Amino acid sequence: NDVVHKQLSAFGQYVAEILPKYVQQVQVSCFNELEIFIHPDGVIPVLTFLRDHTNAQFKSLADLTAVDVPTRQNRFEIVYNLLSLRFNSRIRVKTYTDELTPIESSVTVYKAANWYEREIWDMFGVFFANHPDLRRILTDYGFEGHPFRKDFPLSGYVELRYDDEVKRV
Amino acid sequence: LVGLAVCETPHERLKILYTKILDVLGQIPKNAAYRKYTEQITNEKLGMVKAEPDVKKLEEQLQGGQIEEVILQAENELSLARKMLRWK
Amino acid sequence: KGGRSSVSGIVATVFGATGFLGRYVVNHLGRMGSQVIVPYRCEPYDTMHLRPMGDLGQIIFMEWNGKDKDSIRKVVEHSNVVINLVGREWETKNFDFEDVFVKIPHAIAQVSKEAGVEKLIHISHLNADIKSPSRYLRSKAVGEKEVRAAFPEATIIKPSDIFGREDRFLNYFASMRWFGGVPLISLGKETVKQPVYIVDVSKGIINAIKDPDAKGKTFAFVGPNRYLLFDLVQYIFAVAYRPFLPYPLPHFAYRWVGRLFEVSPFEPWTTRDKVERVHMSDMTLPHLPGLEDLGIQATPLELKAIEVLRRHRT
Amino acid sequence: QPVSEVGSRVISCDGGGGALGHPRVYINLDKETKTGTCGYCGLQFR
Amino acid sequence: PAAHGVLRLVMELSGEMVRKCDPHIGLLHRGTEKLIEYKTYLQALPYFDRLDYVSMMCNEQAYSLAVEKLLNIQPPPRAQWIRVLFGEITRLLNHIMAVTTHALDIGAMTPFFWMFEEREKMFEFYERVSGARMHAAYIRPGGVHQDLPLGLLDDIYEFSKNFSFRIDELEEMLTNNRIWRNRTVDIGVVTAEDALNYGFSGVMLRGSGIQWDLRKTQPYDVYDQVEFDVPIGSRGDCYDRYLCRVEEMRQSLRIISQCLNKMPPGEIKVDDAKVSPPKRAEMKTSMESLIHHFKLYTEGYQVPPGATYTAIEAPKGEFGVYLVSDGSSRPYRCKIKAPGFAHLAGLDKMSKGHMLADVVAIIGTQDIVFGEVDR
Amino acid sequence: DMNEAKRRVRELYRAWYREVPNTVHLFQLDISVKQGRDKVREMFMKNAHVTDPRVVDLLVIKGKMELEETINVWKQRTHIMRFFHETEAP
Amino acid sequence: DITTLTGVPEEHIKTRKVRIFVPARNNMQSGVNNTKKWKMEFDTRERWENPLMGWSSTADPLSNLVLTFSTKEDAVAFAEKNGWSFDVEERKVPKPKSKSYGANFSW
Numbered sequence A: 001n002d003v004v005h006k007q008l009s010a011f012g013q014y015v016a017e018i019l020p021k022y023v024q025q026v027q028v029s030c031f032n033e034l035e036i037f038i039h040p041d042g043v044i045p046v047l048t049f050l051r052d053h054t055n056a057q058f059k060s061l062a063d064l065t066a067v068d069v070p071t072r073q074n075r076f077e078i079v080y081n082l083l084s085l086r087f088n089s090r091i092r093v094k095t096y097t098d099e100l101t102p103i104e105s106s107v108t109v110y111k112a113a114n115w116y117e118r119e120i121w122d123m124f125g126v127f128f129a130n131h132p133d134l135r136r137i138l139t140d141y142g143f144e145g146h147p148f149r150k151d152f153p154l155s156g157y158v159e160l161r162y163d164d165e166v167k168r169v
Numbered sequence B: 001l002v003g004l005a006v007c008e009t010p011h012e013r014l015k016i017l018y019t020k021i022l023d024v025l026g027q028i029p030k031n032a033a034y035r036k037y038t039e040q041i042t043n044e045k046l047g048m049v050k051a052e053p054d055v056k057k058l059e060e061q062l063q064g065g066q067i068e069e070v071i072l073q074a075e076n077e078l079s080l081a082r083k084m085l086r087w088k
Numbered sequence C: 001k002g003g004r005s006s007v008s009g010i011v012a013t014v015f016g017a018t019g020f021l022g023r024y025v026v027n028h029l030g031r032m033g034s035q036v037i038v039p040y041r042c043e044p045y046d047t048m049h050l051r052p053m054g055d056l057g058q059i060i061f062m063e064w065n066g067k068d069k070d071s072i073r074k075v076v077e078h079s080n081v082v083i084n085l086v087g088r089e090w091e092t093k094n095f096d097f098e099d100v101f102v103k104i105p106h107a108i109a110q111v112s113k114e115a116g117v118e119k120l121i122h123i124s125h126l127n128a129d130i131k132s133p134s135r136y137l138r139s140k141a142v143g144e145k146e147v148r149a150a151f152p153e154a155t156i157i158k159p160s161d162i163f164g165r166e167d168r169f170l171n172y173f174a175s176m177r178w179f180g181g182v183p184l185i186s187l188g189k190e191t192v193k194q195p196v197y198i199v200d201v202s203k204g205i206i207n208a209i210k211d212p213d214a215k216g217k218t219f220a221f222v223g224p225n226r227y228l229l230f231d232l233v234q235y236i237f238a239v240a241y242r243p244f245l246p247y248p249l250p251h252f253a254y255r256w257v258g259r260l261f262e263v264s265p266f267e268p269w270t271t272r273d274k275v276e277r278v279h280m281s282d283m284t285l286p287h288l289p290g291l292e293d294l295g296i297q298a299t300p301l302e303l304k305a306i307e308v309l310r311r312h313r314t
Numbered sequence D: 001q002p003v004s005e006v007g008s009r010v011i012s013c014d015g016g017g018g019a020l021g022h023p024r025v026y027i028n029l030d031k032e033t034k035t036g037t038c039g040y041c042g043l044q045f046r
Numbered sequence E: 001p002a003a004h005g006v007l008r009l010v011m012e013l014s015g016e017m018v019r020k021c022d023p024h025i026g027l028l029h030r031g032t033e034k035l036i037e038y039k040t041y042l043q044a045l046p047y048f049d050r051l052d053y054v055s056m057m058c059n060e061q062a063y064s065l066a067v068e069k070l071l072n073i074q075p076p077p078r079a080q081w082i083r084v085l086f087g088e089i090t091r092l093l094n095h096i097m098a099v100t101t102h103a104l105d106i107g108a109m110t111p112f113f114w115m116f117e118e119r120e121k122m123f124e125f126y127e128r129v130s131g132a133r134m135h136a137a138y139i140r141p142g143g144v145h146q147d148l149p150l151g152l153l154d155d156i157y158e159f160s161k162n163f164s165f166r167i168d169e170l171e172e173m174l175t176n177n178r179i180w181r182n183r184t185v186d187i188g189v190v191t192a193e194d195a196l197n198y199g200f201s202g203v204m205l206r207g208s209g210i211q212w213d214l215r216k217t218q219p220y221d222v223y224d225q226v227e228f229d230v231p232i233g234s235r236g237d238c239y240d241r242y243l244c245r246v247e248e249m250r251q252s253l254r255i256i257s258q259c260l261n262k263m264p265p266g267e268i269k270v271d272d273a274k275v276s277p278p279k280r281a282e283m284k285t286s287m288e289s290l291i292h293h294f295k296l297y298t299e300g301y302q303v304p305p306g307a308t309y310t311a312i313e314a315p316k317g318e319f320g321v322y323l324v325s326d327g328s329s330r331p332y333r334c335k336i337k338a339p340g341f342a343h344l345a346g347l348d349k350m351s352k353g354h355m356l357a358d359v360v361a362i363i364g365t366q367d368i369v370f371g372e373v374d375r
Numbered sequence F: 001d002m003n004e005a006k007r008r009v010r011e012l013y014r015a016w017y018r019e020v021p022n023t024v025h026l027f028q029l030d031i032s033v034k035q036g037r038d039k040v041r042e043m044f045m046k047n048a049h050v051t052d053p054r055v056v057d058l059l060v061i062k063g064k065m066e067l068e069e070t071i072n073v074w075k076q077r078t079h080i081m082r083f084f085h086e087t088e089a090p
Numbered sequence G: 001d002i003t004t005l006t007g008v009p010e011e012h013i014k015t016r017k018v019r020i021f022v023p024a025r026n027n028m029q030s031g032v033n034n035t036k037k038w039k040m041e042f043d044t045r046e047r048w049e050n051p052l053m054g055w056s057s058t059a060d061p062l063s064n065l066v067l068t069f070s071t072k073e074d075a076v077a078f079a080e081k082n083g084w085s086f087d088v089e090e091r092k093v094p095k096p097k098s099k100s101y102g103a104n105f106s107w
C-alpha cells in the first residue's frame, strides 16, 4: 500500500521537524516500517517524548534488540521497537555504541525494559547507565565471555561433566 | 479500564489541563516547531472543550475513546513540557 | 590434547574394578580419554556408574569368569595392557581364599604371555612378605611370586592400604563406634601403619604405565607419615567428633570375636583374617621402587580425612 | 540382470515407474562396442 | 511440579507470605539465536517449533510471515486458509494446556484428563497432515508444505461439532465451582495502563479491559474474512483471564466453522520455484525443476538484505520476530520476541505480599512457558 | 584516571578475603582455608597489568557480581570449586 | 586492549594468529561476488579422528569462526582492539586486460 507509506513518511517528517536535535535520519523501510536514528547520548530524551503525546503515544517496548557488527567505529547497534495503540502502528528507533562507552539504561522511559538491560548485558559487553541491577541471565554462573559477540565460538570454550574421583560436575 | 478511575465533570479539570499546558509551554522560544504544533492541536482541542459542554458526544469529538483517559494523556503532556525545556 | 575425546594407545583390562578399585584409575584413564575394557563378574547394575566415565565407545563391559581359562582369554584378547585387581578380604566359599590370590593371577599371567600382552601389572599388600598371621599376605605372596615367575617383566604394586572416604578401612574403624568402644589389643605402639590413598595411588598406577622405566620393578606405595595406630584412631574420632573409647583387650578374645562374626552368610563386618589385618604394622622399607620414583608426590592424609568421614558426623 | 536391448537408438531410463525412481535420463547407444549402463539405475542397455 | 521443571524462583519468604519472588530464568537457555545464524533460512524453521512448543504452529506462521515480507511474496489463498485454520487449532491447544495445567497446579487434577483426550485427537490431525504428532514443520516461508489429505476436513468437522460439549462441561466444573472462584478472583490484578508500561501482551492486556488485539487490529491473513468476538475482561484478576481463555476457545471454535465453509481449491505452495521447491513428479522430469530443487536444498534461497519485526497473535500473546537478512542465504540476526518474557518480568510487581500458594496460581495465570522465555 | 579505580579493587579484595572463610564454612568446601585466599590473590594477579582508564572499573563491575553470587548462595560448590581446575591433566 | 573483558582463555589470544585477507575466487566458478570484502580467518590447529565411526573429532575452541569486513584498516584495527596477532594480506585485483575479436584475424 502507498497510503501507509505516505502517512509514515509524513509522520517521519513530522517528528523530524518537531525534535531535530538528534534525529539523524528517518528512513522508511518500503514495506511500511518507519525507523529514525538516535545519537547514543540522546536515547532517554527521544524515547521519553516517544511515549509523550503528540501522536507518539508509542507505549510498550516490543523489544530491545542488540544487533552486532564487527566493523564500524562502534560495533554494537541497539534497537527499540515501539507500538502506539489508538493509531495502531509501530516504529523503531535505534542507536549505536562503543564496546566501552556506557550508554544509559532506558528502563524508566518505556517501563517494561528491566529484563532487557540484563539480557543485553549478559549477551554482550554493552553497559546501561542508571540501571538498578544488571546481572547475568541466560547463562551459567561464571561463564564470563558474552555470547552473541558475532565472534566467539558457538561451542564456547567450556563444558561440564561429572567426575567420580571428585564426585562432582 | 481497571486502573482508570471515573471522574465526573471533566470540563473543569480540562480547563486546568489546557491552561497548564499553554502556560508551561509558554516559556518555549518560538524557535522549535514543537510549540507550534503542540499549541496548534492543543488550542483546537480546547476550543472543542469550550465548544462541547456535554460529554456523551464530546468523546465523539476528541476522536478518542474515553476522554477520561486522554485527560491523563494531556497529563502526560504536562510533565512532557516539564521536560521540554530541561532539554532546552 | 589429552582430554575426554582424546585417544591414547591404552586398551587396559581391569578385572574387578567394581570395588574401591578401580573407579578412580578408570577415571584418570577417562580424563585422558584412553579406552578401557573393564569386565564384570558380578551384575550389570553395580557396574552402571562406571558408564559416564567413558566417551561413547570407550568403556566396554565384558562378561567373564576367573575360573575358565578362555573366559579370561576373552577380555585380554585385544588388550594392549592387562591389570589384575581381584581380591576379597574375607574369603567367600566358592572362591576359596587361595585361588583368588593364586590361580586367577596365574591364568592372567600366562594368558598375558600367549596373547603377547604388552604389559601386565598386579597388586599385593606391603606385608605380603610371608608371615604366620593372616593367609592373605601369604596367598598374595604366592600369586605375586607366581606371576613374577610367569610374567617376570610385570611390575607389581605394593600398597599398604590406600586412603579413600569410601575406603573399606578408615570407614571401618570409624564404624567401630557402633559396637561401643574401639578394640585395641594393647593400645599405643602395639602396631603402626601408613596409607597410600585413592587418588595418589591411582595417579601413580597410570603414571607407571606412563613410565618406560616401570618394567619388572616391584612398586610400593606408602603414606608420608608413620602414624601410630592409637593416635591415628584418636584422629579418626577427632574428625568424626564421635565419643572416643579405647577398648584394651587380651589378644585371643578379639579372635573369638572374629570367629563370632565370620558366621554371617552375607558380608561380615569383621573376620579373623581382618583380625590379623589389624594388629600387624607395615614395614618401613623405602629402597624398593615406589610412588615418588614415579615423580608423583603423596597427598597428606591430614587434609583429606574430613571429606572421607563427614558422613559419620552427627 | 540381463542387458536390455532395443533396435532403436536413444532410450529413457527412469529406474522403474514414474516419480518413484531416479530422474529421467536418456542413455545414448552410439557405440555398439559397449553396453549403455544407466547413470543411476545401473542397468545396462544396448 | 509448579516450577514447570525449569524455574528457580528463589524468594525471601516471611512466616509464609512471600516478600519478594526472584525469578532466575536461563535454566533452559538452550542458546538458539547463536545457532540460527549459522544455518540457512529453511534449516532454521524447526527451531521455532522448539520455542513455544505448546503452540507449535503459530510460531511457524510468525516466521513465514517474517520472511515473506522480506521476500516480498504472497501465498496462494488456500494456503492462507490452512495457515489460519491450524493457527486456530493450535489456539485451542494452548488454551487447553493453559487452563488445564493451571488447574492442575491448584489441584483440580480431573479436568486435565478430560481434555487431553481431545488434545490427543488434535494431535491426530497434526499426525495426519504433517506426519508428526507435534513439532510439525509444516508451515513454510513459501506458504505450506504438502497439501492436506482428502479425508481430513470431514474428520475435523465431526470433532469440532462435538467439542463444545466438552469445553462446556469443563466450564461446569470450574466457572461456578466457587472453591475455584475464591482461590482465583482477587489475584493478581494489574493496572490497565501499568500493563502497557510493562508491555504485557494478549490476554494479560484484555484482562484489564483494554480493547487491543492484533487479529482485529492489524490483521495479517484471512482474518479480514473471518468474524469472531474478542472477549474483554474487566477486573484483571486471574479469573477474568481464565474466562478470556475459555471464551477465546469458543471463538476459535467459531473460526473453524467459517474456514471450513470457505476453503478454496488451488495450489498451496507459491508458484515461485526460486523460493518453493518443485513438486516431486515434476523435478524428476525437467531440468530447471531439478536445478532449483537442488539449489534450494544446497545453498538455499537468498533474501534481500533488510530488517523487520513481524508480530502475530500467538495464543500466549503476540509473538515477535526481528530478523535481518544480510542478503546471504544465512540470516544475520534473528532476535525472537517472547511474549512470556515480559510477563514473567512483570510478575514480581504483580505478586508482592501475596500468599505463597497464590504466587503459584499467579505463575499459572501468566500461562508462561520457560522454553519460550529462555529462547 | 588510574589509582582512583585501584582503591576500588583493594576494597574488593577486602570484601572477598574476609568473606572467604564464610564461603568455606557455609559451602562445606574442603579446600584448605588458606588456599581460597591465595587463589583469590592470584586471580587478582591475573589482570595485574591492565592499564586502560575505563577498563579497570569495568573489571570491578565484573568483579562485584561474583562475590554478589557467593554471598547470596547463588552458584554452588561445583560452581565455586570450578576455579581450581583440579581435574585437569597437567 | 580488551583481553581481560573477553572470557577467552589466554592460549587463543596468544599461541595462534588471525589471517586477514580478501578471499580468492573459486576458480571453478566464473563468478566474482564472493571474492570481495575482507575476512578474518584464523589458523588451523589439530583435528584427529574419532576412534569410533571415524568422525573428525576436534579440540580447538574456535576453528570455524570467520568474519566479513568492508575495509582492511578496519580489520587490522579490529584485531588490535582484541589484541590479536595478524597476517594482513594484499587485495589482489586482476590487472585489466586488452581484448579484441579481430586480433584473432591479423593474418
Ligand SMILES: NC(=O)C1=CN([C@@H]2O[C@H](COP(=O)(O)OP(=O)(O)OC[C@H]3O[C@@H](n4cnc5c(N)ncnc54)[C@H](OP(=O)(O)O)[C@@H]3O)[C@@H](O)[C@H]2O)C=CC1
Binding pocket: C015, C016, C017, C018, C019, C020, C021, C022, C041, C042, C066, C085, C086, C087, C088, C089, C095, C100, C104, C123, C124, C125, C126, C158, C159, C160, C161, C162, C163, C168, C169
Ligand atoms: N587400601 C586398600 O584397599 C589396599 C588394597 N590393596 C590391594 O589392591 C586391590 C584393590 O583394592 P580394592 O579395589 O579396594 O578391593 P575391592 O574389593 O574394592 O576390589 C576387588 C574387586 O574385584 C572383584 N573380584 C575380584 N576377584 C573376583 C572373583 N574371583 N569373582 C568375582 N569378583 C571378583 C570384587 O568383587 P566384584 O567385582 O565381583 O564385585 C571387587 O569388585 C585389592 O586386591 C587389594 O588387596 C593393596 C593395598 C591397599
